[PDB]
Amino acid sequence: AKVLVLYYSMYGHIETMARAVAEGASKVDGAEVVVKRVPETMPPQLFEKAGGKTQTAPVATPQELADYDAIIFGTPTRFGNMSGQMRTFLDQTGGLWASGALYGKLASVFSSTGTGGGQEQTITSTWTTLAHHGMVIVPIGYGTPYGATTIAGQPSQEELSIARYQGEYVAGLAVKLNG
Amino acid sequence: AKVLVLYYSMYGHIETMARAVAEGASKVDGAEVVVKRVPETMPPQLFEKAGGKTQTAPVATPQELADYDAIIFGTPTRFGNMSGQMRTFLDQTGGLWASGALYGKLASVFSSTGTGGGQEQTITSTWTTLAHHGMVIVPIGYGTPYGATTIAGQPSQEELSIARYQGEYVAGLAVKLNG
Amino acid sequence: AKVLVLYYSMYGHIETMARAVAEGASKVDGAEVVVKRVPETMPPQLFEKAGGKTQTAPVATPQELADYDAIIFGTPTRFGNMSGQMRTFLDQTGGLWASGALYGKLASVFSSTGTGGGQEQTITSTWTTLAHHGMVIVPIGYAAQELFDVSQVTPYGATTIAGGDGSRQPSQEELSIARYQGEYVAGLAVKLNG
Amino acid sequence: AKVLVLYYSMYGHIETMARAVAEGASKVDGAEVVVKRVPETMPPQLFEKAGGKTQTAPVATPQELADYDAIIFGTPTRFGNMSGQMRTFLDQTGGLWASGALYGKLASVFSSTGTGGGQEQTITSTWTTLAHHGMVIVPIGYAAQELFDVSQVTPYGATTIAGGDGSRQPSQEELSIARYQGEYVAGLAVKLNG
Numbered sequence: 149a150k151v152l153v154l155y156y157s158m159y160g161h162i163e164t165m166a167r168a169v170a171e172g173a174s175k176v177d178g179a180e181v182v183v184k185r186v187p188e189t190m191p192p193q194l195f196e197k198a199g200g201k202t203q204t205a206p207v208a209t210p211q212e213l214a215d216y217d218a219i220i221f222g223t224p225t226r227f228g229n230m231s232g233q234m235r236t237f238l239d240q241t242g243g244l245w246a247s248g249a250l251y252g253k254l255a256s257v258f259s260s261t262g263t264g265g266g267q268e269q270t271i272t273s274t275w276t277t278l279a280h281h282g283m284v285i286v287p288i289g290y291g292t293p294y295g296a297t298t299i300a301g302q303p304s305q306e307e308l309s310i311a312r313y314q315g316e317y318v319a320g321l322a323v324k325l326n327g
Numbered sequence: 328a329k330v331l332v333l334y335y336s337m338y339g340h341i342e343t344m345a346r347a348v349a350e351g352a353s354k355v356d357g358a359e360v361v362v363k364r365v366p367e368t369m370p371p372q373l374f375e376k377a378g379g380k381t382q383t384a385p386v387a388t389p390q391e392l393a394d395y396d397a398i399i400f401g402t403p404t405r406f407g408n409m410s411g412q413m414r415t416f417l418d419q420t421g422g423l424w425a426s427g428a429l430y431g432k433l434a435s436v437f438s439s440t441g442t443g444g445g446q447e448q449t450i451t452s453t454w455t456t457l458a459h460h461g462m463v464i465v466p467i468g469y470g471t472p473y474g475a476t477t478i479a480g481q482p483s484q485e486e487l488s489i490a491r492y493q494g495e496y497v498a499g500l501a502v503k504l505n506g
Numbered sequence: 507a508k509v510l511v512l513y514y515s516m517y518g519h520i521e522t523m524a525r526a527v528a529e530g531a532s533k534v535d536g537a538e539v540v541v542k543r544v545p546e547t548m549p550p551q552l553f554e555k556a557g558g559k560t561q562t563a564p565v566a567t568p569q570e571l572a573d574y575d576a577i578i579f580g581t582p583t584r585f586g587n588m589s590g591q592m593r594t595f596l597d598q599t600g601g602l603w604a605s606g607a608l609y610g611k612l613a614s615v616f617s618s619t620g621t622g623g624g625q626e627q628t629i630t631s632t633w634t635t636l637a638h639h640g641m642v643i644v645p646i647g648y649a650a651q652e653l654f655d656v657s658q659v660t661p662y663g664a665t666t667i668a669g670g671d672g673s674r675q676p677s678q679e680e681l682s683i684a685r686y687q688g689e690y691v692a693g694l695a696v697k698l699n700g
Numbered sequence: 701a702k703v704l705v706l707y708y709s710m711y712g713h714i715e716t717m718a719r720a721v722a723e724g725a726s727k728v729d730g731a732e733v734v735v736k737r738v739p740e741t742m743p744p745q746l747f748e749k750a751g752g753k754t755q756t757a758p759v760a761t762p763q764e765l766a767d768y769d770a771i772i773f774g775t776p777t778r779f780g781n782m783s784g785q786m787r788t789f790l791d792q793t794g795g796l797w798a799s800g801a802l803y804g805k806l807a808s809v810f811s812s813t814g815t816g817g818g819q820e821q822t823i824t825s826t827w828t829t830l831a832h833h834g835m836v837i838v839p840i841g842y843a844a845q846e847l848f849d850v851s852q853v854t855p856y857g858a859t860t861i862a863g864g865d866g867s868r869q870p871s872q873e874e875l876s877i878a879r880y881q882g883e884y885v886a887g888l889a890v891k892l893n894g
C-alpha cells in the first residue's frame with residue numbers, strides 16, 4: 149500500500165511531526181511511504197520577513213494525491229482552521245472530486261499549535277474536506293483523540309511518539325485494505 | 328463481519344431510514360446485520376403527549392456495541408446535534424471507552440431533519456464522539472457527503488436509496504477488514 | 507438585564523465554575539443574576555452509587571429561559587459534546603424555538619474536562635443549538651490581561667481540568683477566566699437591555 | 701457605527717450576496733457600510749481561463765479590519781470550509797490578533813454552494829476563527845417573517861445555490877435573507893457603538 153504524508157509547515161513544527169509520522173508508517177511491512185509538502189504561497193520575500201523555515205521536501209501536485217491508498221495530512225493550527233496554504237492546495241482538488249479519485253481512500257490529520265487552543269477545530273474542519281472527497285477518516289482515539297498534535301508555547305519526545313503511532317496505525321489499515 | 332444499525336427515532340423517520348440502511352448492508356455477502364434502538368428516555372405519558380411513534384425494535388445496551396465490526400448510527404437532527412436520547416445512551420459508553428472496546432471499528436452516521444438545516448452539524452458532531460472511541464469514520468461523499476439524510480418539511484425513494492448505499496458501502500468495508 | 511447561568515454538573519466541577527461565572531456577572535450593576543441547573547436524568551440510586559454530587563441550585567424549566575436577556579450555559583465535556591442531561595433539556599425548547607422566544611438574546615458557554623480532549627468541540631457544538639434559537643454567541647477570545655482578577659492568566663469559553671480521576675478542583679486561574687466570562691457577558695447584556 | 705462587508709467571490713455569487721447584505725445594512729441610520737473583497741490569489745491568466753469574474757469592489761488589507769465595529773464575512777463553500785483566498789487573508793491577521801484589535805466587535809457570515817452540501821460547515825468553521833479574535837458571533841436563526849422584504853421566505857447565515865454548473869443566480873428569496881442579515885447586524889452595531 150502507498151502512504152503519502154502531505155504537509156504544510158512555516159516554522160518547521162509540522163515538518164518535524166511529518167518525519168515522525170513517516171517513520172511510524174515505515175514500520176509497517178508492505179507500506180510504501182512518501183513525504184511531500186504543499187507549495188508555499190507567500191512570495192519568498194514575505195516568507196523570509198516572517199522568519200519562515202525554508203522547506204525542501206518535494207512539492208506535491210493536487211492531482212497526484214490519487215496515486216496513494218492513504219494520505220496523512222499535516223497542518224499548523226491557524227485560528228482553528230488549516231493554513232491558507234493547505235486550503236489553497238485543497239481548493240485545487242476539484243478535478244479529483246469530480247472524478248471520485250480519492251473516494252474510499254484512508255485519510256488522517258495531524259497538527260501543531262501554540263498554547264491558545266484551536267487544534268481540535270483545525271483537525272475536525274480538515275476532516276470535513278476529506279469527507280467531501282469520500283475519504284475514510286482515521287482518528288487516533290486514546291492531546292486529542294482526533295490526531296497527533298504538538299504544542300509549543302521543538303516537539304516533545306511523547307508528541308513524536310504519538311505521531312509515529314498515527315503513521316504506523318494508518319499504514320497498517322492501508323495494508324489491511326490494499327495489500 | 329457483524330454490522331449494527333443503531334438508531335433513535337421519535338416520529339418514525341429514522342426508523343424508516345434504519346430499515347433501508349439494514350437492507351443495503353444485507354446485500355453484502357458475509358455481513359451479518361442487526362437493527363436495534365436506543366431506549367426512549369421520555370416517560371410514555373410524555374412520549375404519547377408529543378405524538379410519538381412507539382418503537383418496537385430490540386433495545387440495545389451500551390455494552391453490546393463492542394460485539395460489532397461496524398456500527399451505523401441514526402439520529403434525528405435536534406438543533407444541529409444528535410438527540411438527547413442518543414446522547415444519553417452514548418454517555419453510558421464510558422466503560423467501553425476505558426477498555427478500548429470500540430477502538431478501530433467502523434462507524435457511520437445517518438440523520439433525519441426538517442427543512443431548517445442542521446443535519447450536517449448533527450452528523451459531524453456525532454463523529455466527534457465516535458472519534459473519542461477511536462472509531463474509523465465513514466462518510467458517504469458524493470444531500471450531504473457526511474451521511475444519508477431525509478428531509479421532511481415519509482422519506483423519498485431517492486433518500487432511501489442513498490441510505491441503502493450507505494449500508495452496503497459500510498458493510499462491504501467491514502467484510503474487507505474482518506471477513 | 508437578567509442573566510441566567512444554566513448548568514449541568516455530575517461531580518461538581520461545572521457547579522464550581524457556574525458559581526464563578528455568576529460571581530463575575532454579579533459585578534455588573536444592573537445585571538440580575540440567577541444560577542439554575544438542568545434536571546438530573548439518572549435515577550437517584552444510580553447517581554448516588556456513581557459518586558454523583560447533590561446540588562443546591564434550583565432546577566430550571568425549559569419555559570423560563572424566555573425570561574432572561576443572556577444565558578450562560580455550562581456543561582461537562584462528554585466525548586466532545588454537551589452532556590445527555592443538557593441535550594435532553596435543550597430538546598425540550600421546541601416551543602421556545604417556534605415562538606422566537608430566545609431570538610437575539612446573548613448566549614455563552616463554559617465547560618470542564620477530565621484530561622483536556624474534546625473541550626473545543628463541546629463548546630462549539632453547543633453554539634450550534636444556540637444559533638438555531640437565533641442567539642448571539644459570545645466567545646471569550648483572549649481578553650486583556652488586566653480584566654482577570656488573577657494575574658498571569660481556549661478562546662471559545664472558560665474551561666477546567668478535573669483530572670483523569672475527577673479529583674482535581676478548579677484552580678484560581680481557571681476560576682478567574684470563568685469570572686471574567688460572566689462579567690463580560692453581563693456587561694453586554696446591560697449594554698443591550700439596560 | 702462602521703460596518704464592513706468583506707467577501708471572496710470567484711464567479712460572482714458571493715459578490716451578489718455581499719451587495720444584498722450591504723443594501724440591508726444601509727437601511728440602518730447611523731450605520732456607515734463599506735463593501736470590500738479579499739485579494740484574488742490565482743494568477744490573472746489562470747483566473748480568467750477558469751471563467752472567473754472581475755469585480756469592482758476595492759481590495760481590503762488585513763490591517764483595516766480594525767477600523768470597523770462589525771464585519772460581515774462572505775465566502776463560497778469550498779469542501780465545507782471557507783475559500784483558500786479568505787483563509788490566506790485571515791492568516792494575515794496575526795498582528796490584529798496580538799493587539800486585541802477585533803476583540804468584542806460583531807461578526808457574521810454568509811455563503812454560497814453549488815448543490816448545498818457543506819454550507820453549514822463553511823459558516824461554523826469560519827465562526828471558529830472569529831472566536832479566536834474574540835468577536836461576538838451573530839447567527840441569523842429563523843427571523844420573524846415580517847422582517848424580510850420578500851414574503852414567504854440554515855440559521856447560521858444567509859446562503860445561495862449556484863447550481864452544479866454555477867449558472868444559477870441568487871433568487872429574490874435568498875437575497876431577502878441576505879438583506880435581513882445586513883440590516884440585523886448593522887442594527888446591533890449601532891445599538892452597541894452609536
Ligand SMILES: Cc1cc2nc3c(=O)[nH]c(=O)nc-3n(C[C@H](O)[C@H](O)[C@H](O)COP(=O)(O)O)c2cc1C
Nearest residue numbers: 157158159160161162224227228261262263264266
Ligand atoms: C496566523 C496564525 C494563526 C495561528 N493560530 C493559532 C491558534 O489558533 N492557536 C494556537 O495555539 N496557535 C496558533 N498559531 C501558532 C501555530 O499553530 C504554531 O506556531 C505551530 O507550531 C506552527 O507550525 P509550523 O512550525 O509547522 O508552521 C497561529 C499561527 C499563525 C501564523
Ligand SMILES: Cc1cc2nc3c(=O)[nH]c(=O)nc-3n(C[C@H](O)[C@H](O)[C@H](O)COP(=O)(O)O)c2cc1C
Nearest residue numbers: 336337338339340341403406407440441442443445
Ligand atoms: C427538539 C427538536 C429539534 C429539532 N431541530 C431541528 C433542526 O435543527 N432542523 C430541522 O430541520 N429539523 C429539526 N427538528 C425536526 C426533526 O429533525 C425531524 O422531525 C426528523 O424527521 C425527525 O426524525 P424521527 O421521525 O426519526 O424522530 C427538530 C425536532 C425536535 C423535536
Ligand SMILES: Cc1cc2nc3c(=O)[nH]c(=O)nc-3n(C[C@H](O)[C@H](O)[C@H](O)COP(=O)(O)O)c2cc1C
Nearest residue numbers: 515516517518519520582585618619620621622624
Ligand atoms: C461519558 C463521559 C464522557 C466523557 N468524555 C470526556 C472527554 O471527551 N474528554 C475529557 O477530557 N473528559 C471526558 N469526561 C470527563 C468529564 O468531562 C469530567 O470528569 C467532567 O468535566 C466533570 O464535570 P462535572 O464534575 O461538572 O460533572 C467524560 C465523562 C463521562 C462520564
Ligand SMILES: Cc1cc2nc3c(=O)[nH]c(=O)nc-3n(C[C@H](O)[C@H](O)[C@H](O)COP(=O)(O)O)c2cc1C
Nearest residue numbers: 709710711712713714776779812813814815816818
Ligand atoms: C474547490 C471547490 C470546492 C467546492 N466545494 C463545494 C462544496 O463543498 N459544496 C458545494 O455545494 N459546492 C462546492 N463548490 C462550489 C462553490 O461553492 C460555488 O460554485 C460557489 O458557491 C460560487 O460562489 P462564487 O461565485 O462567489 O465564487 C466548490 C467549488 C470549488 C472550486
